[PDB]
Amino acid sequence: HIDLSALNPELVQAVQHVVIGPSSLIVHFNEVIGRGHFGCVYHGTLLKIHCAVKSLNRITDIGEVSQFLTEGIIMKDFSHPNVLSLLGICLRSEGSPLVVLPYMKHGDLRNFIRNETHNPTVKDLIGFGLQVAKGMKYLASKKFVHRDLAARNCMLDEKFTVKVADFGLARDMYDKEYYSVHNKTGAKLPVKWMALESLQTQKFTTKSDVWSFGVLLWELMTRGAPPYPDVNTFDITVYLLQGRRLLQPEYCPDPLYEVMLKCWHPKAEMRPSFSELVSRISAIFSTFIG
Ligand SMILES: COCCOc1cnc2ccc([C@H](C)c3nnc4c(F)cc(-c5cc(C)no5)cn34)cc2c1
């Protein structure tokens, strides 16, 4: 049940634009197309546009419904070609709401670059990085901190447009291997993507997203290799503090590696902005043919 009185009164108008009438959405529960810790995702058809419908029923309780709606309202206002959009929220009598996302033909960026059937060039891979940078520039301009930027958490549509995903109501752990339980707080953290200061404080900033972006670039240029494989979970802080960074991949251009090292600057405030990353990467990208 939607209680409009409960919402911040300035957001009540926005509710009609986020909520999808059950009549307008058909969900195909017959086959699961995706799995998160919080629930499965299914094909869906919205009024005929193909969408990805995520259930949240694997969570015991959804939380404050007023907050869930507020999250949707905030998320639906985001619009950028390199950011996954929210089409809406559909309310079903039996169970939690369905999250309705655009269908992403080519799945997550990490699996796409790991796939033997596709053969992106070095230029293509740098271009995926640039697209991610533009999406993050947008999110950062909205004062939004992602907290979990990685190749696994970006997706590709049918035109190979890369969209930063896994945020707001689509937030989940979509590959459990890469999340380790903190011993004091119990938080499951993507430690191998995290900045030094975040490993220490568990506080995340746009500048810690910049660190994660550095890692994502490394993933692109290794076509999805796991970072720091011979390091175990929270021993990553000790490893980094020995004076270490991910090594330059064979086909990573030198200036792109220099960008990665700037993304991993020990002082968060000295890391480049996403605007700067877009600028520097666009230049590098422009030097390539094919
Ligand atoms: C090859 O892919 C087959 C098509 O299946 C789809 C298509 N579109 C989707 C759109 C969103 C989603 C969920 C809601 C989602 N939202 N953000 C992310 C995200 F950042 C990553 C993933 C993800 C990673 C992995 C591995 N499996 O799912 C799933 N995500 C799954 C889809 C599955």
Side-chain angles (χ1 to χ4, degrees), residues 13 42 54 61 63 82 98 106 117 120 177 187 191 219 249 276:
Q13 56 126 319
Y42 306 94
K54 199 205 177 158
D61 185 27
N82 307 115
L98 299 166
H106 288 294
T117 73
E177 195 188 334
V191 297
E219 299 180 83
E276 186 180 326

Side-chain angles (χ1 to χ4, degrees), residues 33 41 52 54 84 101-108 111 152-155 165-166 170 174:
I33 64 166
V41 7
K54 199 205 177 158
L84 188 70
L101 296 320
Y103 187 76
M104 296 287 124
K105 188 184 180 180
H106 288 294
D108 70 284
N111 279 314
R152 63 177 176 277
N153 291 329
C154 293
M155 299 189 82
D166 177 54
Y174 293 103

Side-chain angles (χ1 to χ4, degrees), residues 189 199 242:
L189 308 150
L199 292 157
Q242 286 164 3

